[PDB]
């Protein structure tokens, strides 16, 4: 009775289900007395997940989120729950639910109990759960139970829970009746306290590598960072829909699992080079060239498994010249350094392969000088016929590759850090414009970390740090690319001075703010 | 809210000498913060900051006033939020309550509501009372040194859904005002503070035209303003904070702009002959040590051939007075070796038969230049040297007003071929860097108003970087009058919205 | 002093103790309570060897002895507010990425690591300018924190000479994409290297009198303790050359500056 | 005064846990056993543990679980008894012969832990 109201002020449904005694079973077993605090209670805390954002354009057998019980739904219990071993569960939920009374539709909860599938969960599983639905006009903050109904005395703080979940479906889907052409999505943040009876039962040390421990992005600069596709500071964040939005880039990509997918390195010296035992046996009128055997740019070998080249492989159809150490030219004028020319190409001519290693490199020169055999290790330079595709790996035969940024949202496209790679060109042209869907500061947080993930993308705010204030926001998937929401057309771009913040797990299906 | 306390000046009274009562007529009214003035447009995507207000005296008007003959104060303000939105505009918004000593860095959405906060709406009727209790570390705080207090930081949370007219975005305009609770009183009463750190920027009550310009010694003719001309240049004269800390070149004086004092060198003529040697120091009887001033104070800062006047003291053909052109190339044609930052210039003398010069300790009045261009001089052979910064980001919608003079020059291909820009004139520059303000915003209001008439003119925000941006639609150049005084509204924050400029 | 450790409360502890000793640790401070993000100080421990201890069966050169301590806050603990857990913090964690020494960049030049190393053959004091840090946000030298700008420098060039001794470039040394170099107390840019010798650079330039072609000319500069002439970066303006015989012109906007060889290294400061 | 004695006698508190009170409603026989193994310490069936100057200085020496395999008795009674709940006490002694100069943690650490390296 706050605001003046067209709307369901109050919603008590009275959900069935008979109150768990927990808290006072694990007393007896765990040889410890742990109370929490008196103020983490009475004090309602957003949890860092299923922040949801419902859509005119979800069907009614969707899901919005799916929490699991646990102490991943604070950041106060997520915090303590890097001591303990082990909790004993009870939360009061309070789903915030917003928009108009231009709005329509519901939402149901159900409390799922722990032994039951996690595959379908359709519209007609609402009689059959514990539940409540709830209009999405509402005014009052949604406050329901989220108990445990478990078979133990406590469960395990690590993956051992397999307790009660909370699944949201829209159960009619968010009609409006603005006449206009305003976005209403619907964007609700719930958020959790724990009840009167939430304890944890064992205290075993701090380790830091805890599932549901807060991610976070380091905080340097954009521009102060490593493209992970060449070695180039970056020139720019920046979207545009007119490029391909799908595209098969090997080396930057990363699992924020903390699992390097593709050809990607940890490094931004070890990313689109070469480290190779040379050979140079062929010489006639045709210039001289390079059969060299490659290697894992250390001192291991190079034995293809499923990382469809080496680590540091450059992804990219083009005449790039390596300039290499080319060991000992043997008598007089002795410089060594040498630019090799490669095509790398799709499939150029003859046997250029780099799943089994031996590249071709050559350059025309009339001087047949004689060079050392070794471990050489190359750099590129000035790449010639650029065109951003995959090469043709195995000769033109297939090979296991990363798949590709994946599944947009229909109005999204990625944002691909730009950088202006060194060139050869006929025409007076310029800005080569290569472009990756991660940093090397990202790549290298992420492979060292080894993060959870509990859903699937996380917010990422971006903030300028002066004259600040919200350049945009954007939810990063657990495959590695950042994807707006621009519905658009043309390159818009960012400016370079912002850093990457976080704000919590959402699932595939959040709206994002559109930008311009 | 979560907070629980028992008391806050009980605990200080014993350890006070007197708490001082302050009467219980100010205890009732409800009088705006200075810069917690907030607008939740819809396009703003949720998590930003829309106010982060602390405790203290400078919340309310008389609380600052007030506060300026006590040693200190205790207690607790108290906060009523106000939002300008009827209904049809769902979206909520956190006031949470931040205490001292929390570090801002960053504060995302699951940050807001993990403080003791209070989650409110746009929808709202009522307004929001909300408490501002001063988590203390000590007994009383000190008014006269700015100290952790309590933070109330607000941030919008599920953002605003609303629907929008044609060409007027609604804006959820909102507000805070500060009222001291009954636990609020000040601690011992000390009387003689003149300069305080709650004063407000003042802005004299001198004409535009009547002030001297901070770049050329001349008066300032011109207040225009040209989308046009680059929007971010790099002055080095006329430069200065609202701090007080100059920045640059800038002397506190209209007489030492645009010139210097050095210790004069006569040696060369051979023929072609007629050079001098200056030997750079300070035009207040100092010496020059190069540290970050790019040049001495007041040193010419733009690229053409200034003639500039001497002393003399000439031995033979007249006494010890006479002037002479001294041709003095500043600008990027490095014939000499040009080098202010060493202090180290050279002048070609005159036009004359041979010689008859005599060295000294002169001073060089300008006189006329040859070409002028908005281009820094080289300071250092060409190298770079640490200058001042250039004019800072502005909002997307403006521009900077500048303040025309005229140089007198020798062209010979048109009449009044420039004019000289600056923002902020000497009789501000000086006004600043001798009261020496303590600022709260990065911005500060402004309202250009003429005497005679009392019509504003325009409104224009002072940023703290010491420049005045002016929110001009356009691309051509205009004018104002110049006789309005300018005047202060309040501490307005960085991307504030000014009105227009027509 | 050796006696004025003595007028605290203190513990004299034996070396060749069993079992081990207890201290309390109460605030004697003069503020309320004590904010976890500042640094003021509290009631110190001073532990300090009171006589010097000797051995005699490890007496042929030492024998050190390990101590640990152990803390628990007895009973009169607490935290007198409820605050986010925020990441930056104070007494957070100090760990070090899971990452070996080899895939890993190095931070002198840009090329991976070859291996740890151990060379006591050598006063054993460098004075090096990139790649050291603290355990802090600060970098002091000229230290990026990407591995892209190390011994790599972005510049503003400027070509002079039509080859006759060669055609001599002018840098002016902006910061990696950064913004205007405006030199203060770094002594170089962000990522100027701190060797010496001759490091040849090669340079995207936009060569074109006729238009057939686009380069990487890829000359040579002197960087040396004792170079030929004018080499000063701390205010920035680099003297580059190239052998050339007969030069076309270089269109000269903004370059960035990355090498590929050195002639003659030596491991001393720039 | 207080007089904070230092160098006490040392102790691990926590709590009685269970009193098989917790598996009583479901286990059938709660069966006691033999109330003179409740008064011998008895070398346990795995044990014997050896540290040395050349091992390394943050090794887990031994890593004992908590099971009637820790007591030669209850491993003679755990053939019959298909179940068990209850508490130990674990000795540990060493040899060192009043000269080797170290320490050594010994630690409970809870179940459902991570098992890799502490």
Known sequence: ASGQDLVPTAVEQAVPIQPVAGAALAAPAAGQ?????????????????GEFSISPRNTPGEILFDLALGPGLNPYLAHLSAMYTGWVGNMEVQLVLAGNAFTAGKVVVALVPPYFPKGSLTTAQITCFPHVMCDVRTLEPIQLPLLDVRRVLWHATQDQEESMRLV????TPLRTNSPG??????????????????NFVYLTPPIERTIYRMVDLPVLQPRL????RWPAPIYGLLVDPSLPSNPQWQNGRVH???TLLGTTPVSGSWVSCFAAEAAYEFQSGIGEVATFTLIEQDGSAYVPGDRAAPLGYPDFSGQLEIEVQTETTKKGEKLKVTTFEMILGPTTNVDQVPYQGRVYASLTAAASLDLVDGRVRAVPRSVYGFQDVVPEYNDGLLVPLAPPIGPFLPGEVLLRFRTYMRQIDSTDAAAEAIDCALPQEFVSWFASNAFTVQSEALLLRYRNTLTGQLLFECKLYSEGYIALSYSGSGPLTFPTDGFFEVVSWVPRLYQLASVG
């Open 256 to 258: 924020v699992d903390g």
């Open 33 to 49: 007395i742990n109370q929490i605090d008196p103020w983490i209670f009475q004090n309602f805390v957003q949890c860092p997940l």
């Open 168 to 171: 949201c479906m829209l159960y």
């Open 225 to 228: 960072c490593t493209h992970a």
């Open 181 to 198: 052409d305003e976005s209403f999505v619907v964007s609700g943040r719930l958020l959790s306290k724990p009840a009167a009876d939430f």
